[PDB]
Amino acid sequence: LRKRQLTVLDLHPGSGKTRKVLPQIVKTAIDRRLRTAILAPTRVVAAEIAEALKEYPIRYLTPAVKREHTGTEIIDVMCHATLTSRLLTVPNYNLFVMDEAHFTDPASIAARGYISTKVELGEAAAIFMTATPPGTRDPFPDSNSPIVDVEEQIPDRAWNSGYEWITDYTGKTVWFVPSVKMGNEIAVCLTKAGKKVIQLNRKSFDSEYPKCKTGEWDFVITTDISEMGANFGASRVIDSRKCIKPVIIEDGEGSVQLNGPVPITAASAAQRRGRIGRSYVQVGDEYHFSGPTSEDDHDFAHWKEAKILLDNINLPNGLVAQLYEPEREKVFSIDGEYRLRTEQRKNFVEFLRTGDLPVWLSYKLAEAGVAYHDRKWCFDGPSINTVLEDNNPVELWTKSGEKKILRPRWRDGRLWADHQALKSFKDFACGKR
């Protein structure tokens, strides 16, 4: 009960989290009438926490709905981003428990800032659970069983020769890639070599990660989303230590671009490696990697985007929350700099929630006075912002009846990162939501 005292913020890692630790915390919170928020990084982990807590009365919260049996529940389970979303449109929780608290999704960073600030104000206690606390930099941490770390060349595309070590192995392998496209090229190569392959990414995770529990697979090819609580029962990880992440370019109008494979942080590398080595009775787990790690992640867009979110959340004291202490050095702006005026903020929240637009773009739109329903901005950008599909400009029928080339006022590369993103953006440009 040492961790449940107001003004306490506790970090810890381990193994035994949902069978015992989380239920004990929840049991004590209920006995003490502590209004509690349990925060999971993903819908999968929220589900697994909710199942671990099946013996207790809990409320499940999404950004839009609540699931309860009586309405008298005091323990809420939700995704990190659901807290941030509801703060932008919320109980004065006495206790926060954040699982996988290293997640650098902007809404997760902002949630840690809000929670950290509530703790420092003496309004709450918080527990951050993660094997790689924000601020840490150790890519080869200790493990339950020794890991064989092997630095060697890793394919970044299909191969027609060599790499015998990849396909001759008969255990299960988790292979982290920087992009879904690269993962698919590798997955097809492995499949034509007689391997059973599952591909995991943010869009496929809810349907495909559950298939890993059947054990009917040889390889999981995954993006970095599997750094947030995925449990594989594998024996090998392959990791070129790359990611592709948005970068805000502050020159001119400003823009966001997706910068090609760049090195991951040491904490990310430790989380990728940390998929294995988890069991004393399974020895010989291997981590095959190439490339350095890098802590120059200040240029990744999620830090500024977290600050934009936090600057637009009101506090009881009339001020604004700060980022969680070890993360404050990632952003170089003065607190409150991104706070939007009244009508702008209303449109901001709508672009985020109903529009499903990235934080940076939603801020630029809102700040420029764009109304949520006004789609002129999708078509009134300069010709350099023309969106291409199959090297042809995208032409759309607008809600006003005109056929126009898709030319957003600001370029945010996440709007056309893949076919599904582009389709969603085309639907938005046409007024479909």
* CATH code (residue 287): 3.40.50.300
Q: State residue 412 phi and psi, 5-degree precision.
A: -130, 110
Listed in sequence order, the residues at least 6 apart from 333 whose beta carbon sits closer than 8 Å to its beta carbon are: 304, 307
Method: X-ray
- For the chain, counts of helices (H) and of strands (E): 12, 19
Pair (289, 303) in one structural domain: no
Selection from 2, 50, 47, 64 nearest residue 22 by Cα: 50
Pair (164, 190) in one structural domain: yes
Listed in sequence order, the residues at least 6 apart from 433 whose beta carbon sits closer than 8 Å to its beta carbon are: 354, 355, 356, 427
How far apart are alpha carbons 270 and 132 in whole angstroms? 7
Q: State residue 102 phi and psi, 5-degree precision.
A: -90, -10
Pair (158, 256) in one structural domain: yes
How far apart are alpha carbons 351 and 377 in whole angstroms? 13
Pair (251, 380) in one structural domain: no
Resolution in A: 1.7
Residue 262 CA: distances (Å) to CA of 21, 25, 139, 159, 299 = 36, 39, 16, 22, 12
The structure tokens 């092997």 sit at 150
Pair (48, 81) in one structural domain: yes
Selection from 97, 62, 102 nearest residue 81 by Cα: 62
Identity of the amino acid at 420:
Q
How far apart are alpha carbons 272 and 370 in whole angstroms? 41
Tokens encoding 167: 């396909």
Pair (265, 182) in one structural domain: yes
- Do residues 136 and 181 lie in contact, with contact meaning Cβ atoms separated by under 8 Å? no
Selection from 299, 258, 256 nearest residue 411 by Cα: 256
Residue 296 CA: distances (Å) to CA of 262, 264, 300, 330 = 10, 9, 9, 9
Percent of residues in the chain assigned helix, strand, coil, to nearest 5: 35, 20, 45
Strands (E), 34-176: 36-40, 58-61, 66-67, 75-79, 95-99, 125-129, 148-151, 173-176
Q: Which of 98, 129, 160 is the last residue in one of the domains?
A: 129
Residues forming beta bridges with residue 258, ordered by sequence position: 246
Selection from 84, 91, 85 nearest residue 37 by Cα: 91
Give the domain range for residue 405: 299-429
The structure tokens 């230590």 sit at 241
Selection from 344, 340, 361 nearest residue 425 by Cα: 361
Count the domains in the chain. 3
Residue 353 CA: distances (Å) to CA of 62, 157, 275, 427 = 12, 36, 32, 15
Pair (164, 80) in one structural domain: no
How far apart are alpha carbons 235 and 241 in whole angstroms? 18
Identity of the amino acid at 115:
I
How many residues are listed for the chain in this entry?
Answer: 433
Pair (217, 203) in one structural domain: yes
54 is a domain residue: yes
SS3 335: coil
Q: Which of 269, 294, 319 is the last residue in one of the domains?
A: 294
- Do residues 388 and 286 lie in contact, with contact meaning Cβ atoms separated by under 8 Å? no
